[PDB]
Design a protein around this nucleic acid. Structure first.
Ligand SMILES: [Mg+2]
Ligand SMILES: [Mg+2]
Ligand SMILES: [Mg+2]
Ligand SMILES: [Mg+2]
Ligand SMILES: [Mg+2]
Ligand SMILES: [Mg+2]
Ligand SMILES: [Mg+2]
Ligand SMILES: [Mg+2]
Ligand SMILES: [Mg+2]
Ligand SMILES: [Mg+2]
Ligand SMILES: [Mg+2]
Ligand SMILES: [Mg+2]
Ligand SMILES: [Mg+2]
Lengths: 135, 80, 131, 156, 199
RNA sequence: CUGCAUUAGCUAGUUGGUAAGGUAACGGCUUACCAAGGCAACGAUGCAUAGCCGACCUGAGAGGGUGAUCGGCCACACUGGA
RNA sequence: GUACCUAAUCAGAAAGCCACGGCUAACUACGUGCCAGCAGCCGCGGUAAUACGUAGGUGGCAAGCGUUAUCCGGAAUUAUUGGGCGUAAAGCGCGCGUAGGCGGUUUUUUAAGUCUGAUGUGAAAGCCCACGGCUCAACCGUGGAGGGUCAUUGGAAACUGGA
RNA sequence: GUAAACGAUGAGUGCUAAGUGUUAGGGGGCCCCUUAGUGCUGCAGCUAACGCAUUAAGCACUCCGCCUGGGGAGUA
RNA sequence: GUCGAAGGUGGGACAAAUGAUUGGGGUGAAGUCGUAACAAGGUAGCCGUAUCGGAAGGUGCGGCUGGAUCACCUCCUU
């Protein structure tokens, strides 16, 4: 563009989207509205718990939960690790990070937080699955 | 002692009684691209005798508030 | 239509230098003549001739090639342009090629090189870079 | 002459049955004293590809003007979509370069410089851009001679 | 010291005698671990830079955070960044004590200074990180003037660099001037570490 | 010193003058009269968002992001008026 | 009765986290067998898995180490610095024309832009440089430098602007 | 009021080797020079390559229009 | 008595949520029907427009080459 064209219409940068929109929103109950706040995790209640089939070429029964967050947004969260103790009405902590195999699963459920238990029999990378030191 | 700001500009309207609006022209530079771009600011100045006329280049000086938006007084008519 | 005679002169010089031409005729002007004289003094061109004819006259430049047919002028760049004019202070005067080139400037004290501008402690409109 | 293997690439030509695989090696060769060159070699195995690349590089060498371990002045070497900006630095700075450019500069003997690859990062064209810049580099004495003056006259 | 590990395994990994004797590399100059022997892989550029940084860091027995901070403050001095960093590492009270010879090992000198057996300009200094400067004096605590370890290290007549002037009758050293690259160890390419911290 | 034109018209004490009242003070600050002025594509008006700054994070720089702690200025004290 | 100092006793109370296919420093054995699982991207897993879990070893850090969230960087990926529009995204289907942007040569004049000197100010704290005090450091203190598109005033006239 | 409305190539201006056709003129001796178009071939230069190359996609200046991963969608 | 907060009444403006029902869109595993496009893709393809048809699509009109091709004349380049 000419300098005159830049002066008339300055350059405009591309806007960046969040990978975890459900964590960027809080809810004010008194005013019954949403509010913009960046959060690293959110509490939620597991509306459903079950398994999903990944997209090709992968094949598996990946464990996930449909969770209502404290801000009233309903999301799918993956359950990492081997074995979990989650059912409907379980209260779980949700963090960002999607599962590439699972199409609509954009969050993870923290292990070893609120109701969710650590992975039983985990000994390497235990902090990633909320397992205490066996000793 | 202390003097007050003085501007020179063209008259662009005098339909008001004893008040003329003076258009002072300046050139602010674009802060990023650095090009020279025109900047106009209209000044409401006091014209007691209606001496100034639409078109003439006049001189104004800052004064105390004289009206809702009048802050200047005509000093002399530089050209006509 | 024509909008930057200095640009045009520099581009004529660049094209002639690329084709390894020996001489170069362009319409004349005071600023072009001072630029050409600065180039001659600095050693980028061989000679400058002025033809004081009608229609503003003509400037006849003679370019300079070194041994092995090497080109003395590596490149010419217009800095200040009609669409955006560039000025610099004495303390902000740019060095072309770490000093191995010249920046032709226009100053209150006549159009001079960046070295003279720095020496006399003046600034002005940076007409061009040449190296 | 020191030699560094920049990249080794397994290319394929398709045939009526299967594919024919070859190894292409890109290599830079330099004396670390202002002489550097690059070459490519194709062979059925990487050692032979490297040997041919070294022979080609040794055949094709360029002289880099330097000033106390850094280039004389800033330059942008370009080849194709490749583009490498290079700027003289001060002693102790190191070679601030990435990829093939660091190999080329080190083998050319430059120890202090700043650089940035502004264009394509395909190794051969990065190397060619770096070599283009180094070839276009100029030195004070040569430019004084070309302009018919002295170094002192040049710097005023 | 802070790093209480197999200094021989570290020397074997890094290919350098951290003690300076060479005992670690004399028998097994290859890297520890199950795959130590018959190891033949080639390090990348990043790997080489990392190995050189680790060589210097484990030679001076420092932690990564303090090492980076020292490198950062050295960068701010006038001159060559790598040489400034090396001389600043040498100026640490641990290095000065070890060079003076009040202990046979760098870790031993670190423990001495930590436990306060040393005095700088006649005052206690418990911090091995202390940066000595030219014109200062390092002494030994009177209550520890007759320690077996110290007296044995003093008996063993080690070489005293030029930038240190030592008297073993009073167990008193003086930091005469700042070191030089030649004086400082030559098995480290400080340019590699400068480039490592460049990226 | 901010985003939007998928906001283009806005303004009637509004713009100016005369007189008076009023104020620490000039002043449409308010009232009576006269006139039809005033702003606006150099973005008025409307909508949305927001305390501002010294500074802080980042970046080679140019820039980009932010406005905790500390200092300055402003605003507010359940909501509104006095 | 805190900091700090002195005297005695004991290596005795005081190391964890992540990673090891490439990027990226660090590899082997078992179990599993497109399942269980992993994953930032490319991907890995169907009997020989350095990619899944465990074990040994190794690497990076260390009273911390990993994960998530957000900002700048890398991104020249809004490009003034510093990108483009034949075929990759991009020349309006084409005129006529308003505002705006830009504008041929010479002479004189003005000094709005432009350049230059002086004065005032741009608080303190902060950042940077130097020095000093806490045993070191963080930190604290003290000077300097910096930071305006700033204002007033005095000078120059080549270029842009005005006559 | 839309087309693959195409040269998929905005307008103006100047500069940078050549060879050879054709359309409408002009000047000097079938030849030479020259203006404005319309074609082909081809240097330097440019380009990812294909190719463009005095009818530039080269070298420059001015102004305008337009682009910023593929779908969703020329949709709501 | 003037001014005057709140309140009441009224017709409009704007924003958000929600709504029987409805529309196309995206993704998904070996689903069903045909086979439009890519070679001249077996009717060259595509663009605009109109109409028709389960569906891709067909057809008409104009336009483009970003179309292959055997025989013919018409020129232009080396
Ligand atoms: Mg070749
Ligand atoms: Mg608010
Ligand atoms: Mg940048
Ligand atoms: Mg950027
Ligand atoms: Mg396109
Ligand atoms: Mg067109
Ligand atoms: Mg169209
Ligand atoms: Mg201050
Ligand atoms: Mg088109
Ligand atoms: Mg023609
Ligand atoms: Mg078909
Ligand atoms: Mg067909
Ligand atoms: Mg039909």
């Amino acid at each position: 563009p000419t300098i005159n064209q830049l002066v008339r219409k300055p350059r405009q940068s591309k806007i960046k989207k969040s990978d975890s929109p459900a964590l960027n929103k809080g809810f004010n109950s008194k005013k019954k509205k949403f509010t913009d706040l960046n959060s690293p995790q959110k509490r939620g209640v597991c509306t459903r718990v079950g398994t999903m089939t990944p997209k090709k070429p992968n094949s598996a029964l990946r464990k996930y939960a449909r969770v209502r967050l404290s801000n009233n947004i309903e999301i799918n969260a993956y359950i990492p690790g081997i074995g979990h103790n989650l059912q409907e009405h379980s209260v779980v902590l949700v963090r960002g990070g999607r599962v590439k195999d699972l199409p609509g699963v954009r969050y993870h459920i923290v292990r070893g937080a609120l109701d969710t238990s650590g992975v039983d029999g985990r000994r390497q990378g235990r902090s990633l699955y909320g397992t205490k030191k066996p000793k | 002692r202390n003097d007050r700001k003085v501007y020179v500009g063209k008259v662009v309207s005098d339909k008001m009684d004893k008040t003329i609006t003076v258009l002072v022209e300046t050139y602010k530079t674009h802060k990023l691209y650095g090009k020279r771009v025109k900047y106009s600011k209209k000044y409401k100045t006091h014209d007691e005798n209606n001496s100034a006329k639409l078109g003439d280049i006049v001189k104004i000086q800052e004064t105390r508030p004289l009206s809702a938006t009048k802050r200047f007084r005509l000093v002399e008519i530089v050209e006509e | 239509t024509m909008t930057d005679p200095i640009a045009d002169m520099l581009t004529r010089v660049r094209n002639a230098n690329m084709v390894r031409h020996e001489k170069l005729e362009l319409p004349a002007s005071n600023i072009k003549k001072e630029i050409a004289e600065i180039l001659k003094s600095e050693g980028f061109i061989k000679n400058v001739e002025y033809v004081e004819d009608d229609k503003q006259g003509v400037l006849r430049l003679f370019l300079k090639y070194g041994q092995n047919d090497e080109r003395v002028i590596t490149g010419l760049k217009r800095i200040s342009k009609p669409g955006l004019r560039v000025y610099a202070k004495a303390s902000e005067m740019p060095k072309v090629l770490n000093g191995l080139g010249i920046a032709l400037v226009s100053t209150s004290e006549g159009v001079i090189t960046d070295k003279e501008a720095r020496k006399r402690n003046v600034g002005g409109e940076i007409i061009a870079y040449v190296w | 002459f020191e030699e560094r293997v920049v990249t080794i690439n397994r290319v394929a030509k398709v045939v009526k049955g299967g594919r024919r695989f070859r190894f292409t090696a890109l290599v830079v060769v330099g004396d670390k004293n202002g002489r550097v060159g690059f070459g490519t070699g194709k062979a059925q195995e990487v050692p032979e590809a490297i040997k041919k690349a070294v022979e080609a590089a040794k055949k094709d060498l360029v002289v880099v003007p330097r000033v106390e371990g850094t280039t004389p002045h800033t330059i942008t070497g370009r080849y194709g979509s490749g583009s490498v900006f290079m700027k003289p630095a001060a002693p102790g700075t190191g070679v601030i370069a990435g990829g093939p450019v660091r190999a080329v500069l080190e083998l050319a003997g430059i120890t202090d410089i700043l650089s940035k690859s502004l264009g394509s990062n395909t190794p051969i064209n990065m190397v060619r851009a770096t070599i283009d810049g180094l070839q276009n580099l100029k030195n004070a004495e040569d430019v004084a001679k070309l302009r018919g003056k002295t170094v002192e006259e040049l710097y005023n | 010291a802070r790093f209480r590990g197999s200094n021989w395994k570290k020397s074997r990994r890094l290919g350098i005698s951290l003690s300076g004797t060479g005992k670690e590399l004399e028998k097994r100059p290859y890297a520890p671990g199950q795959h130590g022997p018959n190891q033949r892989k080639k390090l990348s550029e990043y790997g080489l830079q990392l190995r050189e940084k680790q060589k210097l860091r484990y030679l001076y027995g420092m932690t990564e955070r303090q090492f980076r901070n020292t490198f950062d403050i050295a960068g701010k001095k006038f001159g060559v960044h790598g040489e400034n960093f090396m001389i600043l590492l040498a100026s640490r009270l641990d290095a000065v004590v070890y060079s003076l010879g009040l202990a046979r090992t760098r870790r031993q000198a670190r423990q001495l200074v930590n436990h306060g057996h040393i005095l700088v300009d006649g005052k206690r200094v418990d911090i091995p990180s202390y940066s000595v400067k030219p014109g200062q004096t390092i002494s030994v605590r009177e209550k520890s003037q007759k320690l077996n370890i110290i007296v044995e290290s003093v008996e063993i007549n080690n070489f005293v660099p030029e930038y240190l002037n030592f008297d073993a009758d009073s167990l008193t050293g003086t930091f005469v001037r700042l070191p030089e690259r030649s004086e400082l160890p030559a098995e480290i390419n400080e340019q590699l570490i400068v480039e490592y911290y460049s990226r």
